[PDB]
Amino acid sequence: RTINLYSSRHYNTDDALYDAFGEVNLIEASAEELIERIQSEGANSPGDILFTVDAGMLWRAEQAGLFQPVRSGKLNERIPENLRHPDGLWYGFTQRARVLYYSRDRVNPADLSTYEALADPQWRGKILVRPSSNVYNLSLTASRIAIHGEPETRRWLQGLVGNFARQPEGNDTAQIRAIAAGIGDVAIANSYYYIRLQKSTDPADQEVVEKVSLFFPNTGSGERGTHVNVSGAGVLKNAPNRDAAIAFLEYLASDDAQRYFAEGNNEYPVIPGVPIDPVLAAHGQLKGDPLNVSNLGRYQPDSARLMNEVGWQ
Length: 313
Ligand SMILES: [Cl-]
Ligand SMILES: [Fe+3]
What we know:
Bound molecules: chloride ion, fe (iii) ion
Structural class: alpha/beta
Number of strands: 9
Helix content: 40-55%
Order of helices and strands: EHEHEHHEEHHHEHHEEHHEHHH
Number of helices: 14
Distance between the termini: 43 Å
């Protein structure tokens, strides 16, 4: 049982997941780089699976004609109707929330509400987010354009960029740490990164958790919900290990794999039969935005374009 896996995932604890399945050859790069590669390789690509951390990039790979369909009883039963492709071209295996983090010392959480409100001039020199090319931010801005239209997203972005603590650098975790070091006050980053810190024995990670808290945005009165994205995969069209590939997707939907995603990388499992991690549950029930995740991919070029325009570097 052996695959060639094209992964844009970036979690060292993922290795244990791959080993538990079988012989797994990793081809790891950014989703964009992986898509261009599968394309340039043509009918000769040895790739079996494309595993991303973004429904947007899944949507684009799917639009490009990269996935072959995979119907099976197990998948059909274990993956929610909305977190997958109707024809089964790809499946979402985890869910994750793009949340807000804030300084417990400098921020009153009664001041927080939405991503939108962060363009208020009251956050001059106070916001931390990672670079615009990142897929998480792409998706977020794309969902905003879907929901509010371009002019309003442009406005939000103009405002938000003006409120940057520094030129964006570092990953989601780096923005959480920067809050602790007092470089900024509020950060946009994914939920599961914070839970990792809460479980860490590292005294420096407890120092970040002691200083920084998680706030769910857009969950209040009249608000749509938290931006939720998904990590997912589908079988590539020229898979030389077609059988092993399907075995992998079903393996990702298995109690074991979902239990790993839940309590090893602190994401939200998608299958019934596995609980959300207690440390993640302690924060509250996830109130995610209903938006069809196809929008995330549909508005990606506009998102890239817009963030370029306002100067989000
Ligand atoms: Cl990705
Ligand atoms: Fe991540």
